[PDB]
């Protein structure tokens, strides 16, 4: 059984934990419990293949110690989550992109841009802004909603397919 | 803070409030991972040769364990394990255990027999229950 080590990064309060728990439990966490470090493991089926997802939920403002540079080195795919009602969280996406590319010392790192909280009507980050940022990176962009579970499986399954295609480099 | 290792190669880091028991600190982390405190026990990891971990009561104050590293493990002989999925074509009429719809080409756990669609895989319970 093949394994995929996913890492969820983003600013604080963008819904990193809500998207992960919605995937493995189909339960929407309504409260705000700031994460420190949480590892999950769930068996799913993606494109007819039994996959073992090893998801690591990170903190919003994580300590820049050897612990942060270590999980980025052992991570195989990165989910970059921002809230559409938080423009500052979308601006922080650029830093996560360049930070992952420096710790791994490579390019073509499997990555997916995720715009969360699309159920709210107070949108401050236009969809054109995110698609322009994602197309310049060569990574897919997906709008998600952990509250109503909209394209939550599509966000993680897309990242897994990005790792599958990246593993076929030979 | 306290680093707590959880069953099935998982882990979490919890904040320490004085007076809060270990059960109340790890309750949400266990429920989210499909685990129940009734089937688990919390241990304090030792760093010597004689013994790897020492069991602690679930009501122990987490403040008395700052600087330590904890580990939650299943109790002895609990009927919980990991699933073993496999493709299967259901010649005898079968329905998905998640959506109760017709299941022709799906998946099945070789141990507990949980049958489901491809798109229903996330709703499958995390832990495999086998009572012989
Ligand atoms: N309306 C709505 N609220 C959401 C959505 N996703 C998350 N939230 C809410 O946003 C708040 C913060 O969510 P959370 O998952 O904890 O965010 P986080 O990215 O893990 N934060 P941290 O890095 O501090 O741990 C919670 O109150 C949660 O209910 C969504 O899609 N829609
Ligand atoms: Mg979180
Ligand atoms: Zn099973
Ligand atoms: Zn089904």
Numbering used by the authors:
A (entry chain A): 1 to 170
B (entry chain B): 57 to 188
Give the article text:
These isoforms differ in exon 4, which encodes the final 15 residues of the G-domain and hypervariable regions (HVRs), vital for trafficking and membrane localization.
Strand β2 of the RBD contacts the N-terminal section of strand β2 of KRAS4a to create an extended β sheet bridging the two proteins, whereas the RAF1 CRD interacts with KRAS4a residues located on the interswitch region and helix α5. The longer side chain of E153 in KRAS4a versus D153 in KRAS4b displaces the RAF1 CRD in complex with KRAS4a by 1.5 to 3 Å compared to the CRD’s position when bound to KRAS4b. HRAS, like KRAS4a, has glutamate at position 153, and the HRAS:RAF1 RBD-CRD complex shows a very similar displacement of the CRD to that observed in the KRAS4a complex. We, therefore, propose that position 153 fine-tunes the interaction of RAS with the CRD of RAF kinase. The longer side chain at position 153 in KRAS4a and HRAS displaces the RAF1-CRD by 1.5 to 3 Å compared to its position bound to KRAS4b.
